[PDB]
Amino acid sequence: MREIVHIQAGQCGNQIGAKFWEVISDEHGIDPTGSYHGDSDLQLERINVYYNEATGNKYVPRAILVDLEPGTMDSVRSGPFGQIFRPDNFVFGQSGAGNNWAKGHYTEGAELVDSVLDVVRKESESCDCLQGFQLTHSLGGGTGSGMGTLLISKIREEYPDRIMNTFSVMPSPKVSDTVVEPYNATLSVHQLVENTDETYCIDNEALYDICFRTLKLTTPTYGDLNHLVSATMSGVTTCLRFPGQLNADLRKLAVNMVPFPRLHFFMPGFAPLTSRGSQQYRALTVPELTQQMFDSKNMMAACDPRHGRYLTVAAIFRGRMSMKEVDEQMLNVQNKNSSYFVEWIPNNVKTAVCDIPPRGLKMSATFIGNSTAIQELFKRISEQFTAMFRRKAFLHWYTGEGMDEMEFTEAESNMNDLVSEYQQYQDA
Amino acid sequence: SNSQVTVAVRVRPFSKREKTEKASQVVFTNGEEITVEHPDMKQVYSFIYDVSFWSFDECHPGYASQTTVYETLAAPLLDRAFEGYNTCLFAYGQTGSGKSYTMMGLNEEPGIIPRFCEDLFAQIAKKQTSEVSYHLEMSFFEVYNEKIHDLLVCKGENGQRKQPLRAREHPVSGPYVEGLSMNVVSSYSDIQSWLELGNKQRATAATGMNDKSSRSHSVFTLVMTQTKTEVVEGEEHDHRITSRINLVDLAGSERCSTAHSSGQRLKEGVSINKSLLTLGKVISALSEQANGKRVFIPYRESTLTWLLKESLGGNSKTAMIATVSPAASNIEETLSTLRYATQARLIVNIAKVNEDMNAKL
Amino acid sequence: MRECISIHVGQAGVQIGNACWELYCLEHGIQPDGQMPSDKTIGGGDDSFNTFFSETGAGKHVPRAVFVDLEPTVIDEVRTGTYRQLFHPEQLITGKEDAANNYARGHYTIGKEIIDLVLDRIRKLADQCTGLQGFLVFHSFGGGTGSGFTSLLMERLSVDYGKKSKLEFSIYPAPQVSTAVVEPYNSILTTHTTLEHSDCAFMVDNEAIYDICRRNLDIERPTYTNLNRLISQIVSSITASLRFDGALNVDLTEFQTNLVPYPRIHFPLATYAPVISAEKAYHEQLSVAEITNACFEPANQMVKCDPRHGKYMACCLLYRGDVVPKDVNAAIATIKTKRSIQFVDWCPTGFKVGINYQPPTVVPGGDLAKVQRAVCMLSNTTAIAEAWARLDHKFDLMYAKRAFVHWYVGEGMEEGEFSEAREDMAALEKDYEEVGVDSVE
Ligand SMILES: CC(=O)O[C@H]1C(=O)[C@@]2(C)[C@H]([C@H](OC(=O)c3ccccc3)[C@]3(O)C[C@H](OC(=O)[C@H](O)[C@@H](NC(=O)c4ccccc4)c4ccccc4)C(C)=C1C3(C)C)[C@]1(OC(C)=O)CO[C@@H]1C[C@@H]2O
Ligand SMILES: Nc1nc2c(ncn2[C@@H]2O[C@H](COP(=O)(O)OP(=O)(O)OP(=O)(O)O)[C@@H](O)[C@H]2O)c(=O)[nH]1
Ligand SMILES: Nc1nc2c(ncn2[C@@H]2O[C@H](COP(=O)(O)OP(=O)(O)O)[C@@H](O)[C@H]2O)c(=O)[nH]1
Ligand SMILES: Nc1ncnc2c1ncn2[C@@H]1O[C@H](COP(=O)(O)OP(=O)(O)O)[C@@H](O)[C@H]1O
Ligand SMILES: [Mg+2]
């Protein structure tokens, strides 16, 4: 069987993963004691994609946590679903990075990545056939970028043939929650695009717009944003855990959605999202979802697709539905909005279906899309970055931990070349 | 401000071991055009290249000996190297096609390299005056599973050791290798020693093809520095000139699938073929970059390209030659080369859309 | 004896085979547990035939088939459904990992370590068979397993066994619809080898069955289960001559004889009589003439390929149920009178005929109806050129930019194994253009 590890780094990852497990456990019917209390045998035919087994019919996740400095270690442990995690896997250190990519890549992370990779190996070699790895880290910050990219660069050396799938929170355009976002994000993208197969670029302003406009929520906290990102995380693997009429897996997405290797920066999405009152007036069918997926606002990535072209699209579905309706609607989209798709590929959409839906819904979906619009993000940084580099604003903190300007220029000229590789195909 | 490619080929003659078995010829030529007809007589593929070296029979006109290959391919690289431009030459052919007789040669019939180098030193000793000076450094490194290694270094008195050589992008001078040796050379008797010290440490292995099959790309750089500029109000050079020559040997596009390869030999044919694909993409991008079409040139997908962003592209001049065999037992081995070098299509059915008309006041 | 082997590959293969073996177990009065109360009551007859279901001593019955996917989620649904007790437990879940919708994995880097068990099982099933043989591979183009494993198995079965019939009842890709984007490359690479090592490959197109389902049976929201039952009925119409009795029987060798003129033009099309729903089962006679006219009526073809833009080179017609041959002859002559159905000059004979007295069956949970007669047509036409060239163009648009290759060179496929196949299909696009030319002195 196919199996996944879940590395979980930073103040976003160590908060996302708790929500992700508090979501999958509800799918596989696990309680925070690790025991099972479900109702369907399908939950345990293929539970081993994520969970291992303990002695007394308990189940424990293959979660690794890397920089749980006690403010977050305790926050997970003093929580509902914190008891199940393996304590030897709660790795941590002290004297954190402090919003510094270097302190999380060169100096402190180098002292701890050995201890982390030991847990990675000890968990992997228990698996029968590894399919890939995951990660959920923040960019612009220090540790989620540094330690995450370090672990990636070392894992892909040890385990090159396998998948590595980093679900990252990229910086926001307008409201920056950190003034060293561009340096760290650039230096991380310099190490992600080379040493990664697919990564899904989430952004927070788009999720805030999604939660304020579509769900009509007046008090959106971070846990409600993670509550979405987790749904996507689960919708990506429903084809791997549960059965359907046309299965799929992460390798299929990484094959069909990555025509060229460097163009593996994606825009995810998830249907149907609606308010608690406005669920009485919405018909739950396929075309409603398909409309709510290709909309510019369900985009979690903060990039209007209509400004560019979708090189490739993948749609995972969950529920007892048809295959003709799916194909018909996707063909209608390929034929109506022809300009928003590419010409040198005649079909730019694929499908995957699971015949077992989410616990409280009848039929959901998950969207992945590679576009030329995402370059906007890496254009913004390449305007934010260089202005800081000319007058060398936040530079001394990054030289003082063993770096140089040269590396930064490498990262800049690996971002801008990729922006050009995107912009090659959006004119005509 | 254009470029060229100048793809070419070379059809060897039968070896005696293959001439006594009465092996059937499968490669004919019509001047510029080349063709490949099976022994079964159901299909005939016909290709067209900018150059065609027909080395089958000494009686045929248009006989392309070693010196012909020199004067046709290598001397313009020599010229542009003097004119302050960087040059890059490639040699391709699967095992048995005799790349070595085309590049290096024999001690009675030379190849390209030594003719090129001796014309270099003769032109130097001709132009060598008190004002001008010429300084030459060299290097000979490889690529193996996308990792960089140096063949020129004498290996440490050690076990099996993979080297820490990694790439770095200077913002101006371009990409380079961190820690690569650069030895100086004056006469060819030294460069021969350096190359023969290099090749022995190369990555090779045995297969169904032969015991001697290369499994790592080779790059051989010659950096030439001209020092002529001298200031009149004082002894100072306003500028120097530097030209980078890069002669390159490629690995054969193994079909791992038909060789029942498994393990470390399967992790090479996957890297080799990747580098060849990126190289073909890059050259097919350059050939369009000569025709005014603005496109992207992915020098980043492969190290063999990333180290050559400056040489392959710009005010430079690439070059290629591809060795094939005319025997009817190496047909699928051969045609791939003929289909890998399909970068001589520059005026083949281009469309047309022009809007500028009668511009006036 | 008269026996066949049925192989299935991939999710498409298993999802066809489940319907097929459901139908077979329904026809012979078999229950899902291999047993027969019908023979226990009757006390005679070969009803659970030795052609598909072999026989142990306890009255049980065991299929002459296996299936492999490299994708356990399908077979493990057979090992937990209604039909877990029927099959031999050797359904090859070697699915420690999928074949990534690519041909390189299925043909070499994930087909290694799996195929040998399949050859062992095929030998074990062949040695149980004392006579006639023939393999029915149910696979799929575009997909990686259904392409790679099919190629790697057929090139080995042309080696070990050789002079037997091998028939591929595969799913062609639709030109507009498709559930993938790497479909054409894998399709072409499969064709490159299955033009040699196979003997006749019947094709279908899921868009065609979608149109057939909405237009005739009045089904707006189908599923693949509603299609695979039509396909099982196709196969049953093929095989009724071998299992059951009838006037004119057509053995597997005759299909590959009469419909394959030249060795490279063995890619025909198929159809049935699904103008037949339960409400419209009334209001219609369903004679032989009407169905023989319908089988050539476009929008009922199971491959979207307008034949009027091309020509027919051969046809076979296999009838079930109550048929009197003079009706068959009147029907065939009614087609030969028409001019919108062009034939080649060199096949004036045109048609093969097969008749079987057993009618079809009716799966409970079915969209079709009970009929006293039913038809299956299998035609070889030049029009499928238009069905190839589309996949020949999409390829040429994409391969020019060398997209989607790095995943395939990642698993041993060369850059130059593509053009070696594209030119093969260029030849096959010519050997459908020379066959449709009328001879001249
Ligand atoms: C009466 C009723 O149907 O309640 C629904 C509900 O009202 C709606 C609005 C639910 C509700 O979702 C939210 O309230 C919400 C809040 C913040 C951020 C995101 C969602 C619901 O909370 C969410 C919850 O959905 C699920 O439970 C899914 O299984 C989801 N899992 C969880 O939400 C979950 C969260 C914590 C712990 C355990 C499970 C899921 C689905 C697929 C993959 C991963 C997770 C459901 C059915 C509902 C409520 C409960 C109201 C919706 O949920 C989702 C993610 O699709 C919001 O839009 C759908 C449509 C549902 O109608
Ligand atoms: N007719 C029919 N076709 C199906 C069915 N299920 C899947 N397919 C076809 O299968 C194709 C998708 O690839 P598959 O053949 O399933 O490949 P696979 O079985 O998943 O094996 P891999 O390629 O290794 O993943 C599509 O073109 C579908 O048309 C089915 O139930 N009936
Ligand atoms: N979606 C989400 N983002 C978060 C959360 N917590 C922090 N972040 C983001 O993470 C970034 C800060 O990164 P941080 O983890 O503090 O840096 P690090 O400690 O060095 O890894 C900010 O831009 C936040 O938007 C969370 O709970 N949810
Ligand atoms: N133009 C030529 N005339 C005569 N012999 C040639 C010619 N080109 C190649 N050969 C023969 O080919 C042989 C070299 O093949 P080899 O170098 O082993 O293949 P590879 O270059 O792939 O290693 C030489 O021994 C040489 O005799
Ligand atoms: Mg599959």
mmCIF file of N, CA and C in Angstrom, chain C residues 10-11 20 49 100 113 132 171 178 233 279 283 308-309 338 340 374 379 399 414 421:
data_model
loop_
_atom_site.group_PDB
_atom_site.id
_atom_site.type_symbol
_atom_site.label_atom_id
_atom_site.label_comp_id
_atom_site.label_asym_id
_atom_site.label_seq_id
_atom_site.Cartn_x
_atom_site.Cartn_y
_atom_site.Cartn_z
ATOM 1 N N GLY C 10 -6.170 -2.643 -15.788
ATOM 2 C CA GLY C 10 -6.554 -1.318 -15.369
ATOM 3 C C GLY C 10 -7.971 -1.238 -14.855
ATOM 4 N N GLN C 11 -8.294 -0.045 -14.353
ATOM 5 C CA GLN C 11 -9.621 0.204 -13.812
ATOM 6 C C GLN C 11 -10.683 -0.010 -14.878
ATOM 7 N N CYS C 20 -19.040 -8.082 -17.335
ATOM 8 C CA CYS C 20 -19.000 -9.240 -18.220
ATOM 9 C C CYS C 20 -19.245 -10.533 -17.455
ATOM 10 N N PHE C 49 -20.792 -23.599 -18.655
ATOM 11 C CA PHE C 49 -19.971 -24.212 -19.680
ATOM 12 C C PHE C 49 -18.495 -24.169 -19.328
ATOM 13 N N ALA C 100 1.167 5.777 -12.970
ATOM 14 C CA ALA C 100 1.284 7.214 -13.212
ATOM 15 C C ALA C 100 0.764 7.706 -14.555
ATOM 16 N N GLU C 113 8.891 -7.118 -12.298
ATOM 17 C CA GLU C 113 8.553 -7.626 -10.968
ATOM 18 C C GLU C 113 7.085 -8.008 -10.833
ATOM 19 N N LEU C 132 -8.983 -25.511 -28.189
ATOM 20 C CA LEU C 132 -9.029 -24.146 -28.698
ATOM 21 C C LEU C 132 -8.636 -23.151 -27.617
ATOM 22 N N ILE C 171 -10.845 0.701 -25.133
ATOM 23 C CA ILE C 171 -11.593 1.949 -25.117
ATOM 24 C C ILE C 171 -10.759 2.993 -25.845
ATOM 25 N N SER C 178 -12.177 13.818 -22.686
ATOM 26 C CA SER C 178 -11.130 12.936 -22.199
ATOM 27 C C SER C 178 -10.902 13.233 -20.729
ATOM 28 N N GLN C 233 -22.657 -6.954 -23.166
ATOM 29 C CA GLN C 233 -23.582 -7.531 -24.131
ATOM 30 C C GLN C 233 -22.919 -7.697 -25.488
ATOM 31 N N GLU C 279 -39.633 1.054 -21.858
ATOM 32 C CA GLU C 279 -40.851 1.696 -22.325
ATOM 33 C C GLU C 279 -40.955 1.627 -23.842
ATOM 34 N N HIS C 283 -44.076 -0.640 -28.545
ATOM 35 C CA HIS C 283 -44.140 0.357 -29.614
ATOM 36 C C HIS C 283 -43.155 0.077 -30.750
ATOM 37 N N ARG C 308 -19.873 7.622 -43.453
ATOM 38 C CA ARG C 308 -20.231 8.141 -44.768
ATOM 39 C C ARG C 308 -19.117 8.987 -45.364
ATOM 40 N N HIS C 309 -18.231 9.524 -44.533
ATOM 41 C CA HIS C 309 -17.013 10.167 -44.989
ATOM 42 C C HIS C 309 -15.920 9.163 -45.333
ATOM 43 N N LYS C 338 -28.499 0.365 -51.101
ATOM 44 C CA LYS C 338 -28.318 1.771 -50.779
ATOM 45 C C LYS C 338 -26.958 2.263 -51.247
ATOM 46 N N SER C 340 -25.579 5.345 -49.896
ATOM 47 C CA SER C 340 -24.887 6.026 -48.812
ATOM 48 C C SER C 340 -24.016 5.089 -47.987
ATOM 49 N N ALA C 374 -31.611 -9.772 -30.930
ATOM 50 C CA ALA C 374 -30.589 -8.768 -30.680
ATOM 51 C C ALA C 374 -29.448 -9.030 -31.645
ATOM 52 N N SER C 379 -17.437 -4.061 -37.821
ATOM 53 C CA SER C 379 -17.085 -3.588 -39.148
ATOM 54 C C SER C 379 -15.671 -3.048 -39.175
ATOM 55 N N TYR C 399 4.375 17.483 -28.735
ATOM 56 C CA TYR C 399 5.742 16.987 -28.840
ATOM 57 C C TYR C 399 6.667 18.012 -29.477
ATOM 58 N N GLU C 414 13.318 6.755 -24.309
ATOM 59 C CA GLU C 414 14.166 7.706 -25.010
ATOM 60 C C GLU C 414 13.353 8.851 -25.591
ATOM 61 N N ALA C 421 7.311 5.804 -33.418
ATOM 62 C CA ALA C 421 5.924 5.371 -33.376
ATOM 63 C C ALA C 421 5.046 6.261 -34.241
#
